[PDB]
Design a protein around this ligand. Structure first.
Ligand SMILES: Cc1ncc(COP(=O)(O)O)c(/C=N/OCC[C@H](N)C(=O)O)c1O
Ligand SMILES: Cc1ncc(COP(=O)(O)O)c(/C=N/OCC[C@H](N)C(=O)O)c1O
Ligand SMILES: O=[N+]([O-])c1cc([N+](=O)[O-])c(O)c([N+](=O)[O-])c1
Lengths: 397, 389
């Protein structure tokens, strides 16, 4: 009855191919497997553990609320949800906040709301949604159809219709497809899964102007780039472009399943300042928000980015593997040179062997999404491990 | 118009212990609603609090780049206790249903034909509020107004086997059914209907999908309602009681069906995280015991005897139905459309209850609700009824 890696194949649907070792415990940016091997975590559970593992403040919030009240249905509100709603409203453009569990659910509510607002405020025929190639918005049938990767939306029967995809950063293409029958433009300000590609300023500003012209809602999916990831509370604040609806998840709860959809009173009235929210989830997300939304933590994200980028540059000087280093704050993408095209997974595996956890963003890009408070010592140790992994792969060349 | 139920500003739950809840003013309520059949072991159950806190000190989240011990331990328990051979964990019943419906579609696509896409579902069904799940749900008012719905979904009346036979064909990929429709008036499938679905799915090579989000995890007095009926589905979904108040869900199926998915066919950031799975494991360990499952039947009769006594005094119910601790009490025609008013009257009297449409009262208390709480809460509900009538 020992639980091993082999156990996964006997138990879970074959939709994942997980690592050969099993993390069992973590503190900060260090993680231990069943053999007590120690890893440096630059993956963050895919940009989720924004304050690292078992952060004392988050554990305290969990325990305190866990002794008090876990659950209310959406018939009720609860103090943690009201508190978190207020902090989001005070800190952002939002006047109304709806809480869910996952990024997928938050996006379902955002896309349903944009559709419904158009239906009741303009016309039942105003249904087109513009989205972008390589976008990722979740795995429900609707959200994966708004997602821009046909490989993930093919094969589930008839897709919800009236979704049009154009290239990310192509403002002319958006202009071309938008019209009075368009209800929404949905965009990630930085495409995380899609190779860590940031919107240009002109593109994002252009989406706002086109949404205004056509009476469409601009929906920012900040599930991955939000909650401090870029070094601002939300990426829209870096750009100075205010969306009509914004979604947040991943870092919002520091690891606890929680998500949010933020909008205005005018738009939300198509459906008090908050709706939903698990008491336990919202208590934890409140503690997370209180730490991430501080000048010091947000400044540190930029300091830490440069510490990572200097190491990636040193690695490239030595080994000649990267064509581009991009992203914002502590979402970092390092694109492999053509010689190593398609081999991101080879470097991820060698990384894991060397004791560092990193991500891909497609087969050509390495992705780093560490805790926003990752200690400098852990940045240097993990990046030395990564350099060692790169060395081992390159020596085979 | 269908009116929702919302609490006013003067009713904000702040604390729960067992089957008792207190609001901001310190008013105490007996909880016969369970947050809509979620807190199946009541509020802040010591074993669940212990699981939460101990795993909370250890590991919360690693993503599905990794597997984790609590998830594999919970999957093993679900596999051992049910027809399932493989599982996927998600964060809500809606997400588990999305996974099930996508799996049934994809299985048909790759095993039979990309054209085998019809899904048969039932009027008054509830499967969640995502665009796909609400379109499979059987309340048009809830699926209207969001632009183009995912196609190839056909609705017929619950419990009408003939109608299912009439619409099913070789182009049908699935029949999706709640063994008891919870939101839809607490209506249980008849034995003939449920077995009929299994036979029709076999005939047409379609997958039978049971949504046990509300009726599963002990709610009926068996671990899953399918066990009461002795009809085994191809895919089953579970949530709510599974995590006792922690957001977690599961989709259960066989290896043969699971194998239609490949790496990257579906996924979830949070789904299967060790904190959720540690909590659901603790919940499962308590609910899946002979003693708790027996007690659910004892407790059902305690509630039903109270409901009958209320009816003898006030003449308000035409029918008392459901299974285990999912209880429906249909209002007589004289009280048609009054379920919300009885619910609000209950709250004033210090008891939290549910509706199941405008004509039906619903009860979904903790599976371990104390006999003393059943009697006190039902006395409060009788008082509320006296205020209404
Ligand atoms: C921009 C953006 N929007 C929405 C989502 C969906 O969030 P989720 O439902 O919480 O997984 C995501 C989630 N990405 O997660 C990685 C992929 C996931 N593991 C999968 O395979 O589904 C995202 O990056
Ligand atoms: C048979 C059945 N299937 C799926 C669900 C949805 O599960 P959830 O996403 O875990 O709430 C449910 C949930 N019912 O809860 C009530 C409604 C809730 N407030 C909502 O409107 O989504 C169910 O009864
Ligand atoms: O701090 N710790 O909780 C901790 C835990 C483990 N472990 O194996 O789970 C270690 O190996 C170490 N360690 O190696 O320092 C530390």
């Amino acid at each position: 009855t020992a639980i091993t890696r082999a156990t996964f194949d006997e138990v879970i649907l074959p939709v994942y191919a997980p690592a050969d070792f099993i993390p069992v415990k973590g503190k900060g940016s260090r993680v231990w497997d069943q053999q007590g091997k120690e890893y440096i975590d630059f993956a963050g559970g895919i940009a989720v553990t924004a304050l690292g593992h078992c952060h004392p403040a988050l554990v305290e919030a969990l325990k305190s609320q866990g002794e008090t009240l876990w659950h209310t249905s959406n018939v009720f509100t609860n103090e943690p949800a009201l508190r978190l709603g207020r902090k989001l409203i005070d800190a952002t453009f939002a006047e109304r906040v709806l809480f869910m569990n996952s990024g997928t659910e938050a996006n379902e509510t955002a896309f349903k709301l944009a559709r419904h607002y158009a239906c009741v405020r303009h016309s039942p025929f105003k249904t087109k949604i513009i989205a972008f190639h390589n976008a990722f918005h979740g795995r429900s049938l609707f959200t994966v159809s708004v997602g821009g990767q046909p490989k993930y939306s093919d094969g589930f029967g008839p897709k919800p219709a009236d979704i049009i995809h154009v290239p990310f950063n192509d403002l002319h293409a958006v202009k071309a497809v938008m019209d009075d029958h368009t209800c929404a433009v949905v965009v990630e300000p930085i495409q995380g899964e899609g190779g860590v590609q940031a919107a240009t300023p002109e593109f994002l500003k252009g989406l706002r102007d086109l949404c205004d012209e056509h009476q469409a809602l601009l929906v920012f999916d900040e599930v991955q780039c939000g909650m401090g990831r870029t070094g601002d509370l939300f990426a829209y604040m870096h750009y100075g472009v205010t969306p009509d609806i914004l979604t947040s998840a991943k870092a919002l709860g520091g690891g606890f399943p929680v998500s949010a959809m933020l909008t205005t009173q005018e738009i939300a009235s198509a459906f008090g300042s908050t709706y939903g929210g698990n008491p336990l989830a919202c208590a934890v997300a409140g503690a997370t928000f209180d730490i991430i939304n501080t000048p010091e933590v947000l400044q540190g994200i930029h300091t830490k980015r440069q510490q990572f980028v200097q190491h990636l540059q040193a690695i490239d000087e030595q080994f000649d593997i990267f064509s581009d280093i991009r992203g914002m704050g502590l979402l970092i993408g390092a694109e492999l040179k053509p010689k190593y095209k398609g081999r991101a997974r080879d470097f991820l595996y060698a990384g894991a062997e060397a004791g560092v956890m990193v991500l891909n963003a497609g087969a050509d890009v390495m992705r780093f999404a560490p805790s926003l408070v990752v200690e400098e010592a852990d940045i240097h140790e993990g990046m030395q491990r990564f350099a060692q992994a790169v060395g081992k792969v390159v020596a085979l060349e």
